[PDB]
Amino acid sequence: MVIEDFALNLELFRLINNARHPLLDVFFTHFAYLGSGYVLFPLLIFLFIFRKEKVKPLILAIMLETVLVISLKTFFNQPRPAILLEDVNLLFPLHWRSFPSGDTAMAFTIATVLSHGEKLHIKAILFLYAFLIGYERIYAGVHFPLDVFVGALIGIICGIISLKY
């Protein structure tokens, strides 16, 4: 069962993965680090200093999304675009566990928990960051639009669930 092989998913991927430029390649390569788990420890330390009330919600939300993301990654074991499709523009050598996008889920988890109760321009900054991570995964050729949409969905839900608890 390959859930990534429907017309809307493949046509959307081609539109993003083919609209390229060397400056986009550099920007998204530099930007990808902000969607990895390597920002979590630096971020949590700064939260502990300036926004300690957000530390516990973010930790619980990241735990929720991480468990949910690795579970779906293991059960579905979907191929990434470099395996399913031909002539994929690849920025990172990733091939498997496509569904869903963990970087997108974490980024939307960060944006959901940290936007709560904050000024409007802070919400726009965080959710533009989350959007660019999701766009970066498709531009890098390592994810399908289905992976980043569900990943974003997981991140938003787990962030909201954590804020309520």
Author numbering: 1 to 165
What does the paper say about this structure?
The selenomethionine substitution of the nonconserved I63 residue (I63M) was designed to enhance the selenium single anomalous dispersion (Se-SAD) signal for de novo phasing. The overall structure of LpxEAA contains seven α-helices, including an N-terminal amphiphilic helix lying at the periplasmic surface of the inner membrane and five tightly packed transmembrane helices (α3 to α7). Apart from α2, which originates from the periplasmic surface and penetrates halfway across the inner membrane at an ∼45° angle and immediately connects to transmembrane helix α3, the remaining helices are oriented largely in parallel or antiparallel with each other and perpendicularly to the membrane plane. Looking from the periplasmic surface, helix 5 (α5) is located at the center, which is surrounded by α2, α3, α4, α7, and α6 in a counterclockwise fashion. Fortuitously, a sulfate molecule is found in the active site, which is a structural analog of the 1-phosphate group of lipid A. The sulfate group is extensively recognized by K73 and R80 of the K73X6R80P motif and R137 of the R137X5H143X3D147 motif. The catalytically important H143 is located 3.3 Å away from the sulfur atom of the sulfate group, ready to carry out inline attack to remove the phosphate group of the lipid substrate. D147, the last residue of the R137X5H143X3D147 motif, forms a hydrogen bond with H143. The first three residues of the PSGH motif are conserved in LpxEAA, with the central serine residue (S101) serving as a helix cap to stabilize helix α5, but the histidine residue is replaced with an aspartate residue in LpxEAA. Our structural analysis of LpxEAA shows distinct features between LpxEAA and Escherichia coli PgpB (PgpBEC) enzymes but reveals a surprising structural similarity to YodM, a phosphatase of phosphatidylglycerol phosphate (PGP) in the Gram-positive bacterium Bacillus subtilis with a weak in vitro activity on undecaprenyl pyrophosphate (C55-PP).
